[PDB]
Amino acid sequence: MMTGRQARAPLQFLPDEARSLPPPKLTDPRLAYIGFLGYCSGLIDNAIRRRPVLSAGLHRQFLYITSFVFVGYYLLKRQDYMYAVRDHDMFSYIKSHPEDFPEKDKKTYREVFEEFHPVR
């Protein structure tokens, strides 16, 4: 859909205008869920190699958590960037084409006739 937008500046994971956006917090609940996915990957990695699940290799579990939070932070940055580009293109297109987007005259319900269907 938006493939012509990111074609003049190709293969850019986060462009410069993405720095105009507020970055996700470190207490982003999406980022905390990705850290929980890292913790689950650590527990499954202990389980498949028959280690004690909660105890064995805390350095490995912590690197799982760190790696998922590290990748997921940039993935959330790019997510917020692409939705920002989506809405920017939408609003610029609505502004540049007023003839396709007229203001609908909103009628109050004193004029608006609705057909009554009795439940009996």
Partner 1 sequence: MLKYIIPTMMLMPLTWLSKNSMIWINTTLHSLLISLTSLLLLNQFGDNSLNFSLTFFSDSLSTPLLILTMWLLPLMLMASQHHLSKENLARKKLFISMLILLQLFLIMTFTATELIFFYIMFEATLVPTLIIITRWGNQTERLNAGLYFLFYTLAGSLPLLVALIYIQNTMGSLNFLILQYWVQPMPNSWSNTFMWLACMMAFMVKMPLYGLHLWLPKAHVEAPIAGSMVLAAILLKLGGYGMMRITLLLNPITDFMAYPFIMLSLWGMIMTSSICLRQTDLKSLIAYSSVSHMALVIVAILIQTPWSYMGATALMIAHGLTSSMLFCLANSNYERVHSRTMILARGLQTLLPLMAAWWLLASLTNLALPPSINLIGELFVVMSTFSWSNITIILMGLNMVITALYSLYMLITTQRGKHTHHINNILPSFTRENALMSLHMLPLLLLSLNPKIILGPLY
Partner 2 sequence: LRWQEDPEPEDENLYEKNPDSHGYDKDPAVDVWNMRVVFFFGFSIVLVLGSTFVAYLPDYRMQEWARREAERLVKYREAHGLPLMESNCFDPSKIQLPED
Partner 3 sequence: SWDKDVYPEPPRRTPAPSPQTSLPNPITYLTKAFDLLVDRPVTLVREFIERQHAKNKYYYYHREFRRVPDITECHEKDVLCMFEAEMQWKRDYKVDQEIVNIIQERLKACQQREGESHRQNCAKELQQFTQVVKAYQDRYHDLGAHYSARKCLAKQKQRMLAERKATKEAA
Residues that bind partner 2 (CB under 8 A): 110-111, 113
Q: Which of residues 54-113 bind ligand CDL (CB under 6 A)?
A: 54, 65, 69
Residues composing the chain? 120
CB 41 within 8 A of CB 72: no
Residues 91-120, one symbol each (x = binds partner 3 by CB under 8 A, - = not), give ---------------xxxxx-xxxxx-xxx
Q: Using the rule CB under 8 A, is 87 a contact of partner 1?
A: no
Among partner 2, partner 1, ligand CDL, none, what binds residue 110 when CB lies within 5 to 8 Å by partner kind? Answer: partner 2
* DSSP secondary structure string for all residues of 56-71: S-HHHHHHHHHHHHHH
Quick one: which segment of 3-11, 14-22, 59-67, 110-118 binds partner 1 (CB under 8 A)?
110-118
- Helix 29-48 vs helix 58-96: crossing angle, to nearest 10: 140
| Residue 95 to residue 110: CA distance in whole angstroms | 32
